[PDB]
Amino acid sequence: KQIEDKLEEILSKLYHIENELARSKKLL
Amino acid sequence: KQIEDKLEEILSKLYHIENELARSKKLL
Amino acid sequence: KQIEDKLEEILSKLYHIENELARSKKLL
Amino acid sequence: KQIEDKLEEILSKLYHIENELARSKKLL
């Protein structure tokens, strides 16, 4: 549970990296 | 079960980011 | 203990990638 | 242990994303 929580946080960071990468792509 | 699911989502996000960056590289 | 360590390395890698992409954005 | 292993794999993917990002930076 401590672990699953940190996993969820991890995955939210990867969704935020995905956003950054979609943005740089749309701008081009 | 939940943890495993999250681990697999995480990894699969990492494969996508990796391939989006390699694709980017290539068009540039 | 090991797991926690790895979780913290992982998260900290994600913060760095996020900030390297935001920095990139900004210079572009 | 199954978990720590997958964490190690996760982190190796983040080192590989880091490489991709150092490369795109050196090329500029």
Closest-CA distance of chain B to residue D2, Å: 9
In eight-state DSSP terms, residue D25 is H
CA distance B8 to B21: 20
CA distance B12 to C6: 18
Burial of C28 (0-12, 13-18, 19+ CB in 10 A): exposed
Helices (H) and strands (E) in chain A, counts: 1, 0
**Tokens standing for residue C14:** 């994600």
Resolution of the deposited coordinates, in angstroms? 2.3
Residues in contact with A27: Cβ distance below 8 Å, sequence separation at least 6, in sequence order = none
Domain total in chain A: 1
Q: Domain of B25?
A: 1-28
Beta-carbon count within 10 A of D21 CB: 15
Chain A residue whose CA is closest to B4: A4
DSSP helix/strand/coil, B28: coil
**Tokens standing for residue C22:** 């935001």
Residue C7 sits at the chain D interface (C-beta within 8 Å): yes
Q: Technique behind this structure? A: X-ray
